[PDB]
């Protein structure tokens with residue numbers, strides 16, 4: 022089974038197809054001027070960080086959301 026992982030970077034979404042039960046290969050990390058990339062999360066707010074080393078592709082399409090933190 023192959024599903025789509027959508028990568029959403031502040032609403033810009035890129036779709037990649039991934040075989041269920043395999044590890045997902047992370048994209049090159051996004052960048053945002055004045056901000057720091059904090060990782061890919063299962064929700065834009067209130068989810069958890071996907072760990073591409075430990076995590077396995079689900080048997081469904083899903084979206085990973087880039088989270089950024091302002092530089093301080």
Ligand SMILES: [Ca+2]
Pocket residue numbers: 030031032
């Ligand atoms: Ca946004």
Ligand SMILES: [Ca+2]
Pocket residue numbers: 064065066067068
């Ligand atoms: Ca949420």
